[PDB]
Amino acid sequence: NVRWCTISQPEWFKCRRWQWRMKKLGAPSITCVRRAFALECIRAIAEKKADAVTLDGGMVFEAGRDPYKLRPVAAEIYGTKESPQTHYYAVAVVKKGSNFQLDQLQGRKSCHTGLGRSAGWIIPMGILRPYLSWTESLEPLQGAVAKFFSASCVPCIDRQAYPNLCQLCKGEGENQCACSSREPYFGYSGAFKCLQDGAGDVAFVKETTVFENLPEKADRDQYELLCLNNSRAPVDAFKECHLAQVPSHAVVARSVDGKEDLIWKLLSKAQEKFGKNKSRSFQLFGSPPGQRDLLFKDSALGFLRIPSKVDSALYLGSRYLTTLKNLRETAEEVKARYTRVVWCAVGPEEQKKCQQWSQQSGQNVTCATASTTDDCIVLVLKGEADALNLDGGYIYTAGKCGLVPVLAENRKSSKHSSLDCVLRPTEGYLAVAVVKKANEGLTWNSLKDKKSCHTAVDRTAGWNIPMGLIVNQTGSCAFDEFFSQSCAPGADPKSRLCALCAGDDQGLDKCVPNSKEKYYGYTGAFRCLAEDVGDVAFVKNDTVWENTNGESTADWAKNLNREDFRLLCLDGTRKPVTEAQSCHLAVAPNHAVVSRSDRAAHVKQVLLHQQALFGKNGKNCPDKFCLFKSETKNLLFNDNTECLAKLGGRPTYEEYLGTEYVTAIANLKKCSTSPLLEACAFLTR
Ligand SMILES: *[C@@H]1O[C@H](CO)[C@@H](O[C@@H]2O[C@H](CO)[C@@H](O[C@@H]3O[C@H](CO[C@H]4O[C@H](CO[C@H]5O[C@H](CO)[C@@H](O)[C@H](O)[C@@H]5O)[C@@H](O)[C@H](O[C@H]5O[C@H](CO)[C@@H](O)[C@H](O)[C@@H]5O)[C@@H]4O)[C@@H](O)[C@H](O)[C@@H]3O)[C@H](O)[C@H]2NC(C)=O)[C@H](O)[C@H]1NC(C)=O
Ligand SMILES: *[C@@H]1O[C@H](CO)[C@@H](O[C@@H]2O[C@H](CO)[C@@H](O[C@@H]3O[C@H](CO)[C@@H](O)[C@H](O)[C@@H]3O)[C@H](O)[C@H]2NC(C)=O)[C@H](O)[C@H]1NC(C)=O
Ligand SMILES: *[C@@H]1O[C@H](CO)[C@@H](O)[C@H](O)[C@H]1NC(C)=O
Ligand SMILES: [Fe+3]
Ligand SMILES: [Fe+3]
Question: Where does hydrogencarbonate 2 bind?
Answer without folding.
Answer: 455, 459, 461-462
